Design a binder for this molecule. Structure first.
Ligand SMILES: CCCCCCCCCCCCCCCCCC(=O)OC[C@H](COP(=O)([O-])OCC(O)COP(=O)([O-])OC[C@@H](COC(=O)CCCCCCCCCCCCCCCCC)OC(=O)CCCCCCCCCCCCCCCCC)OC(=O)CCCCCCCCCCCCCCCCC
Ligand code: SF4
Ligand code: SF4
Ligand code: SF4
Ligand code: SF4
Ligand code: FES
Ligand SMILES: [K+]
Ligand SMILES: [Zn+2]
Lengths: 115, 96, 238, 263, 129, 209, 60, 176, 95, 115
């Protein structure tokens, strides 16, 4: 999709020559881990909405140069970064499962700090 | 205007006089005790008193901004002339 | 000099001229630094490749300000969060290459050149205004009006006995220190005194990265490993 | 019961009939700036600093004078109320002599504290000021009566409490002087208590006489010893000395004052 | 409602063993709790809202050189602030300190009547205003 | 500006900051007991000291938060409250140029799972928070002392530790070493009663109960 | 391979001393906080304090 | 706005390689480092000789304290006590009693000279600018006691450094 | 600064840069240590009229921090409009 | 409520177990710190001092606080095995400089009024 980016700027972040296909398969995995999560969870109702919108947005436009500002997420070499840990993020709250109500209300005078 | 002490021991304007029984006088041995040659208590003695013909005068200590806040003093009580506490000097009433 | 409610006193008559006389020749001096301390072959090798931090590693070590900027991270408190009048002055942050001792070294000297323009822009932009807020409850009244008006005297008295009372709450505000991200998280108890004023010390968080910063380097490099950073022992301790 | 319902900035509170607006807001706690009314003392409504404008009414009432009317919402933090409080504030301060660094009330002066909270930040005065001649009323109490704001708190303390049919307000206008006319002494066993009631440096304590300042005296809680009343007092301790003795509040034993001997 | 190994111990809190206070300044020192007494020079009341926790004063010897009030009591200057007394006494138990509490006096309600200053026979009539 | 002295307030950023409030509130309603925005347009969510890692990891990895910049973690000892200590973190978002603050409660004997896992920038931040305040952090690499004298006992930043201290140092010729002694001051810190006796700003007026 | 230092050779009261001083008296703490760049510290502390008071400084 | 500081492509022609090869072999950027050192040697040194000359100061300098007095001669110190409440080191110490006439002058004004930081706050605190900081900064000593000042030593400083601070404040009060 | 012209050429050539016109230390260009008296302006509220403190009462305008949820479909919203890529310095692209 | 959370020990026994292993580990270096510290103190003195401050806190009955103490002891020994602590730091416990203090009521009375 044009000249490969030899220097992405940020040191360490490599420049995968297959940014598009990596973005789609990654988004399938993040959509996968969003499969088992129940409907009522606010994680689903919010983050799949951005995911498929972005998954639909990356699929439509196949050129990297413009796609940097379609998703606005900087460069393509790091939009896979918060997405891949979003895949990780869904895995972490496959365990915490916090959509249940408060574990216990704070003490009566714990907050509200004029003293 | 500094007076002397029994051990010489020039007593300051405040009145600090080290008694002959105080062990806190070796600090002064082989050294000198600093007292101010000028005494604020009697520097007001020679300062002239001025008769101003009005009920209340405002003192500023002179120097315009450089001085003391413009506190007023009442020149009606004959007795002793009204003294501006800020300035230390005193204004007189010419007895009308 | 910098006090709450504006700077304490006004500039003397001619201080602006003195800045211009110095600033005129300053780039001439930093060039003298530049020639002998940058392209010197033995300065270059002792500053290139000698310790480097990648992007996410520096970001997750609490590095901030120049320390990220030399590692390629695009961020600067001056522009992203333009505190004070910073949104009216043009300057260029010195983002750099890989991010070794050399990389931030070029970033720092470039900051001085940019700081020279921030001086120059600010030097011919000085407006005919005041030095303190016109709220005597938080700013001591002018001495000329102090010895004339009672409200000044009372306000000066109370401000110089207990000071202004700050409304309760907490606030962490950081500015771009010339070393890193300098923030104070002071918490107000609704009194005339603070309650707890933990500092974000740029030296602190940047000393936190030393362990990873010195993976695999010689003992004589450690002093230079400190040198690319800024660790003032008076500041690291909170 | 007879408790009438009256609002306070919208907040409904039940109040006893006859309770004044200042006392009406006392239960929730507002303490509208005051200079003449005192709790254990009668009311005059002279300083007009307690003036707070009452809702849906184009008139500012005195918080110490008008008790209540059914459901009258007190607008404590009203802009008009702040205007009225600010207006009288620069009024009584206009002729006050600039004595704060030289006045003993410095650091515990009500006039100083009000000017910082419910006060302005400047003066607009461009004329002269009045000066009042001091009248020595004892080697136990001061007289800097040029600082008097004519709150008439003292003259009540003479008429009541101590029972002395004594010092009042002579003259009038800007020259309204609160004194004794003839140089009559003030001997009463409760004379020393005339010191705390005065909100300004007009009447300060002669024995203390500029020995220290309030923002440094470590206060301790102890009991009067000289008399068997066992009065509650607050002892001022600085640098290892005792400078002045302040009465406490205990209701039955001492109300708010003490004898001259223990002061 | 908490599965973080919910284990029950009575042990009225005694962090004193780890609070670091030396053994001298823990038992002999007395602790006093009450609310401020407003200085009758001042009609303000905001002080009398909180509960503060001071210690007992110790000896203050004069420094022979220039008359400093030298003190060897490290705790002579320590005033806390507590909303009520139950938390105040609670702080006295966790840092186990011989306490001495005192209930706060509250303004008794005075009956006020400006019309009483002008009565028909009542002594509340006042000859000056 | 008709009011060039008071700080002009901003409401547009106040709105999305409020919007992000219930956002994070709804995502993890197990721990966020209270979300609070300040008049300085600062966001402060109130969480429980068991789910700090979930809420911290979520904020770090969220594509709609990316608050990867850990500013500082600190404590504010409030002895009045049952949980006197209060561990507080500050986070910054590079992409969203915004700062949010997490606040938790904790007592002397309630450990907190170490935040090194989420923000390993803090490795030294616990080393001082357990130093100055004494709050122990659970499952931590090395909770060591790096901000006080070697062998110092206690936690000086608490409100029970006096500012003067408990140990004073002097060189003695008997032992040829700088040996400890109980503190003894030539002059004592004159405690100042600065707090005003009259009511301050009426806004933060605690209602009586 | 491992490099952890030991600091506190200049650990000082700072925050501990600050609580017993007022805001104005706390200003010198920041001036002496770091020993290299003084003015920029007062930039932070004044900005934080003026933020709490909701008072903006004059433009000059 | 941003500006790259390190990225650069070296030219790869024979002349360019020879330039870089010569630079490493025949040390030219090294010699340049020596080149402008000689320019520094053949330059005037900025060495101020002392006590013969003096690095410039300003009429606002803060140094040795000196309690002044009125032109009539009376002490300016009113025992207003404010300097303590602002002194952030709590160096000063003021205690006063009614004088023989009654005008309160402090019976003890002992600036612990090794305590203060020369704030200028005490100057900014005094409503009668009694306590000032004299332009003197050369008042070192050999015993820790001589640093510990008192009321008399302050007054002597005021009477010794009297013309200078009277002139300095005269030319600086307008800014204040 | 006072050196002869020949030696000035020596240091000029050894440095290659005009050290005469921009010599380091100060000379007869600084502002005179004596200066005219100043007349500092008045503040933004030094008005004797329509200037009640309530109109600028910036200390008490601070409200306790607002509450938007307490323990005691809508689209996802980002906390702040995300930043935009910075532009290369128009003055100079790279060093 | 009174059902408090455990740091590492749910009861006295496991806390007592931790007390044993730190206390047992405390003299594995005691006869060697003095050797490395160039100290003038016999090994027995170190042993009994480790003993006597164990009885100094041998009074509490909550598993958490005693657990905090053993880790505090676990926070103490390695500070002097690896020569981090200096001479005066461990000499501080060995109370020699401090002035001898009275103990009885009469001797308290004779010295000064410091109850
Ligand atoms: C080696 C180079 C040759 C010898 C030195 C030549 C030299 O100094 O030339 C003057 C002068 C010195 O340097 P400069 O910075 O131009 O001087 C600026 C002012 O004129 C300087 O203004 P100034 O106010 O300094 O002028 C007075 C100055 C004038 O000083 C001189 O003229 C130097 C010669 C000694 C007198 O004399 C003094 O200050 C008196 C004190 C002298 C101290 C002791 C000098 C010992 C010299 C060597 C003795 C034998 C060993 O140099 C030149 O004029 C050109 C460079 C040297 C050329 C040499 C011939 C080829
Ligand atoms: S009584 Fe008057 S002079 Fe004294 S402190 Fe109060 S306002 Fe100032
Ligand atoms: S002397 Fe004091 S108490 Fe008496 S009227 Fe004047 S201000 Fe009020
Ligand atoms: S030096 Fe000035 S401020 Fe200090 S006590 Fe004396 S008069 Fe008051
Ligand atoms: S200038 Fe020095 S003596 Fe004066 S208040 Fe400041 S620190 Fe204290
Ligand atoms: S309190 Fe009502 S007027 Fe004085
Ligand atoms: K009074
Ligand atoms: Zn005068």
């Amino acid at each position: 999709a044009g000249l490969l980016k030899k220097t992405t700027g940020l040191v360490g972040l490599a420049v995968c020559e297959t940014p598009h296909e990596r973005l789609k398969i990654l988004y399938t995995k993040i959509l996968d881990v969003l499969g088992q999560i129940p409907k009522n969870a606010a994680y689903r109702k919010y983050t799949e909405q951005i995911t498929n919108e972005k998954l639909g947005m990356v699929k439509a436009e196949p050129d990297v140069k413009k796609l940097e500002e379609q998703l606005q997420g900087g460069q393509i070499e790091e939009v896979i970064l918060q997405a891949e840990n979003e895949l990780s993020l869904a895995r972490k709250m496959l365990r915490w499962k916090p959509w249940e109500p408060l574990v216990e209300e704070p003490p009566a005078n714990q907050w509200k700090w004029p003293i | 205007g500094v007076r002397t002490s029994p051990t010489g021991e020039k007593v300051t304007h405040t009145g600090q006089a080290y008694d002959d029984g105080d062990y806190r006088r070796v600090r002064f041995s082989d050294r000198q005790k600093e007292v101010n040659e000028n005494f604020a208590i009697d520097l007001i003695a020679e300062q002239p008193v001025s008769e101003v013909g009005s009920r209340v005068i405002s003192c500023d200590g002179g120097g315009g901004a450089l001085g003391h806040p413009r506190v007023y003093i009442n020149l009606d009580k004959e007795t002793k002339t009204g003294t501006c506490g800020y300035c230390g000097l005193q204004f007189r009433q010419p007895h009308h | 000099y910098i006090r709450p409610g504006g700077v304490h006193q006004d500039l003397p008559l001619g201080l602006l001229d003195d800045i211009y006389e110095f600033s005129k020749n300053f780039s001439f001096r930093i060039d003298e630094l530049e020639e002998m301390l940058t392209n010197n072959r033995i300065w270059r090798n002792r500053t290139v490749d000698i310790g480097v931090v990648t992007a996410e590693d520096a970001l997750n070590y609490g590095f901030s300000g120049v320390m990220l900027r030399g590692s390629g991270i695009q961020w600067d408190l001056r522009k992203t969060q333009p505190y004070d009048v910073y949104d009216q002055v043009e300057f260029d942050v010195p983002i750099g290459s890989r991010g070794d001792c050399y990389d931030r070294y070029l970033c720092r000297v470039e900051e001085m050149r940019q700081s020279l323009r921030i001086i120059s822009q600010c030097l011919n932009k000085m407006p005919p205004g005041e030095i303190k807020v016109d709220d005597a409850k938080v700013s001591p009244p002018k001495r000329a009006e102090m010895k004339t008006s009672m409200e000044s005297l009372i306000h000066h008295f109370k401000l110089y006995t207990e000071g202004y009372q700050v409304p309760p709450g907490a606030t962490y505000t950081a500015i771009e220190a010339p070393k890193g991200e300098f923030g104070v998280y002071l918490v107000s108890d609704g009194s005339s005194r603070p309650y707890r004023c933990k500092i974000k010390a740029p030296g602190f968080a940047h000393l936190a990265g030393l362990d990873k910063m010195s993976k695999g380097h010689m003992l004589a490099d450690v002093v230079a490993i400190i040198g690319t950073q800024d660790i003032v022992f008076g500041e690291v301790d909170r | 019961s007879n408790l009438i319902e009256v609002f306070v900035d919208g907040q409904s509170v039940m109040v006893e009939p006859g309770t004044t607006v200042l006392q009406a807001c006392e239960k929730v706690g507002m303490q509208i700036p005051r200079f003449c009314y005192h709790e254990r003392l009668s009311v005059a409504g002279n300083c007009r600093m307690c003036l707070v404008e009452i809702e849906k009414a184009p008139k500012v009432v005195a918080a110490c004078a008008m008790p209540v009317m059914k459901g009258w919402n007190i607008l404590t933090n009203s802009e008009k109320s702040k205007k009225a409080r600010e207006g009288v504030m620069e009024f009584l301060l206009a002729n006050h002599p600039l004595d704060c660094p030289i006045c003993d009330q410095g650091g515990e002066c009500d006039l100083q504290d009000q000017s910082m909270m419910f006060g302005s930040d400047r003066s607009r005065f461009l004329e002269g000021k009045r000066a009042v001649e001091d009248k020595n009323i004892g080697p136990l109490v001061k007289t800097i009566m040029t600082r008097c704001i004519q709150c008439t708190r003292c003259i009540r303390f003479a008429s009541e409490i101590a029972g002395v049919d004594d010092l009042g307000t002579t003259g009038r206008g800007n020259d309204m002087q609160v004194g004794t006319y003839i140089e009559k002494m003030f001997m009463s066993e409760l004379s020393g208590n005339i010191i705390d009631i005065c909100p300004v440096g007009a009447l300060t304590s002669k024995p203390y006489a500029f020995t220290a300042r309030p923002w440094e005296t470590r206060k301790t809680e102890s009991i009067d010893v000289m008399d068997a009343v066992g009065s509650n007092i607050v002892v001022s301790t600085r640098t290892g000395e005792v400078m002045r003795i302040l009465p406490r509040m205990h209701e039955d034993i001492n109300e708010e004052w003490i004898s001259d001997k223990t002061r | 409602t908490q599965d973080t190994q919910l284990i029950a111990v009575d042990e009225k809190l005694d962090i004193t063993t780890l609070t670091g206070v030396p053994e001298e300044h823990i038992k002999t020192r007395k602790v006093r709790i009450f609310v401020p007494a407003r200085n009758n020079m001042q009609s303000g009341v905001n002080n009398t809202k909180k509960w503060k926790m001071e210690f007992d004063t110790r000896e203050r010897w004069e420094n022979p050189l220039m008359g400093w009030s030298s003190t060897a009591d490290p705790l002579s200057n320590l005033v806390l602030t507590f909303s009520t007394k139950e938390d105040a006494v609670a702080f006295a138990e966790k840092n186990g300190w011989s306490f001495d509490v005192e209930e706060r006096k509250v303004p008794k309600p005075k009956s006020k009547s400006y019309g009483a200053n002008f009565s028909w026979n009542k002594r509340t009539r006042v000859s000056t205003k | 500006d008709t009011r060039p002295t008071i700080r002009p307030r901003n409401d547009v950023v106040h709105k999305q900051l409020s919007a992000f409030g219930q956002y994070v509130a709804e995502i993890l309603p197990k721990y966020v007991q209270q979300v609070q925005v300040s008049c300085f347009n600062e966001l402060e969510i109130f969480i429980h000291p068991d789910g700090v890692i979930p809420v911290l990891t979520f904020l770090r990895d969220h594509t709609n938060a990316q608050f990867k910049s850990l500013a500082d973690l600190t404590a504010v000892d409030v002895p009045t409250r049952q949980n006197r200590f209060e561990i507080v973190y500050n986070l910054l978002s590079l992409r969203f140029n915004s700062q949010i603050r997490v606040k938790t409660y904790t007592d002397e004997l309630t450990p907190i799972e170490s935040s090194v896992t989420v923000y390993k920038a803090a490795n030294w931040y616990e080393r001082e928070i357990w130093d100055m305040f004494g709050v122990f952090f659970a499952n931590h690499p090395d909770l060591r002392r790096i901000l006080t004298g070697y062998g110092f006992e206690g936690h000086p930043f608490r409100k029970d530790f006096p500012l003067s201290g408990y140990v004073e140092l002097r060189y003695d010729d008997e032992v040829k070493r700088v040996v400890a002694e109980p503190v003894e001051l030539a002059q004592e810190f004159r405690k100042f009663d600065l707090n005003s006796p009259w009511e301050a700003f009426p806004a933060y007026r605690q209602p009586p109960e | 391979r491992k490099c952890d230092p030991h600091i506190g050779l200049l650990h000082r009261g700072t925050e501990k001393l600050i609580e017993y001083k007022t805001y104005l008296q706390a200003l010198p703490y920041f001036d002496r906080l770091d020993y290299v760049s003084m003015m920029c510290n007062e930039q932070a502390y004044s900005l934080a304090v003026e933020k709490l008071l909701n008072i903006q400084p004059p433009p000059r | 706005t941003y500006k790259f500081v390190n990225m650069r492509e070296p030219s790869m022609d024979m002349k360019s390689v020879t330039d870089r090869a010569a630079q490493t072999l025949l040390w030219t950027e090294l010699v340049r480092g020596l080149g402008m050192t000689l320019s520094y040697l053949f330059r005037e040194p900025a060495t101020i000789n002392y006590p013969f000359e003096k690095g410039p100061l300003s009429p606002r300098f803060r140094g040795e304290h000196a309690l002044r007095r009125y032109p009539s001669g009376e002490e300016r110190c009113i025992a207003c006590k404010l300097c303590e409440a602002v002194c952030p080191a709590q160096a000063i110490t003021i205690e006063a009693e009614p004088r023989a006439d009654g005008s309160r002058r402090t019976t003890r004004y002992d600036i612990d000279m090794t305590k203060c930081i020369y704030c200028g706050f005490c100057q900014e605190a005094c409503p009668v600018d009694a306590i000032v900081e004299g332009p003197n900064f050369e008042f070192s000593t050999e015993t820790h006691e001589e640093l510990l000042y008192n009321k008399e030593k302050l007054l002597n400083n005021g009477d010794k450094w009297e013309a200078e601070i009277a002139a300095n404040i005269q030319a600086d009060y307008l800014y204040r | 600064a006072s050196a002869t012209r020949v030696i000035q050429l020596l240091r000029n050539w050894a440095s290659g840069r005009d050290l005469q016109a921009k010599l380091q230390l100060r000379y007869q260009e600084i502002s005179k240590r004596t200066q005219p008296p100043p007349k500092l302006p008045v503040g933004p509220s030094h008005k004797l009229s329509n200037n009640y403190y309530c109109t600028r009462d910036g200390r008490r305008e601070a409200m306790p921090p607002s509450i938007v949820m307490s323990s005691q479909e809508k689209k996802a919203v980002t906390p702040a409009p995300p930043i935009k890529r910075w532009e290369l310095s128009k003055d100079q692209p790279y060093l | 409520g009174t059902s408090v959370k455990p740091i590492f020990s749910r009861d006295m026994n496991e806390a007592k177990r931790r007390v044993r292993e730190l206390y047992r580990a405390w003299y594995r270096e005691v006869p060697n710190t003095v050797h490395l510290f160039q100290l003038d103190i016999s090994v027995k003195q170190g042993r009994d001092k480790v003993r006597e401050m164990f009885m100094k806190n041998a009074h509490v009955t909550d598993p958490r606080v005693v657990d905090l103490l053993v880790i505090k002891g676990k926070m103490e020994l390695e500070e002097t095995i690896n020569v981090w602590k200096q001479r005066t730091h461990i000499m501080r416990f060995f109370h020699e400089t401090e002035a001898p203090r009275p103990t009885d009521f009469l001797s308290k009375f004779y010295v000064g009024h410091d109850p």
